[PDB]
Amino acid sequence: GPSCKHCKDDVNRLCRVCACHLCGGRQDPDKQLMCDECDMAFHIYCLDPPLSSVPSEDEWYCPECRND
Amino acid sequence: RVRTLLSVLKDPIAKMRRLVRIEQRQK
Ligand SMILES: [Zn+2]
Ligand SMILES: [Zn+2]
Ligand SMILES: [Zn+2]
Ligand SMILES: [Zn+2]
Ligand SMILES: [Zn+2]
Q: What residue intervals correspond to the zinc fingers (PHD-type) (chain A)?
């Protein structure tokens, strides 16, 4: 099956494609937002400015896809 | 109510969809 060329989906490794796009961590996956355009993950506390909670919204788009 | 990484990881179909997309991109 598929396996990431960067991290081999090894949970002991960082990956800014498979896990948080800003810190590459797998921690707190319930606080990592998925961008509905690029499907990258982002810790609420890695964003700048940071979010205090997961938005109550239908969809969310990351600063890169928003181009701001 | 946005999707989290945990929501993806817990769903085998969502997880496989994400793996397939990453593999394709890395090609
Ligand atoms: Zn990876
Ligand atoms: Zn992966
Ligand atoms: Zn992070
Ligand atoms: Zn994005
Ligand atoms: Zn980026």
A: 12-68
The Cα A55–Cα B3 span in angstroms is 10
Solved how? X-ray
- Which residue type is seen at A30? D
A40, with CB counted inside 10 A (0-12, 13-18, 19+), is buried
φ/ψ of B21, rounded to 5, equals -70, -40
> This structure's resolution (angstroms)?
1.6
A56–chain B Cβ distance below 8 A for any pair: yes
Enumerate the residues of chain A whose CB falls inside 8 A of the CB of residue B5.
Answer: 19-20, 29-30, 32, 34, 41
Calpha distance A48→A45 (Å, rounded): 8
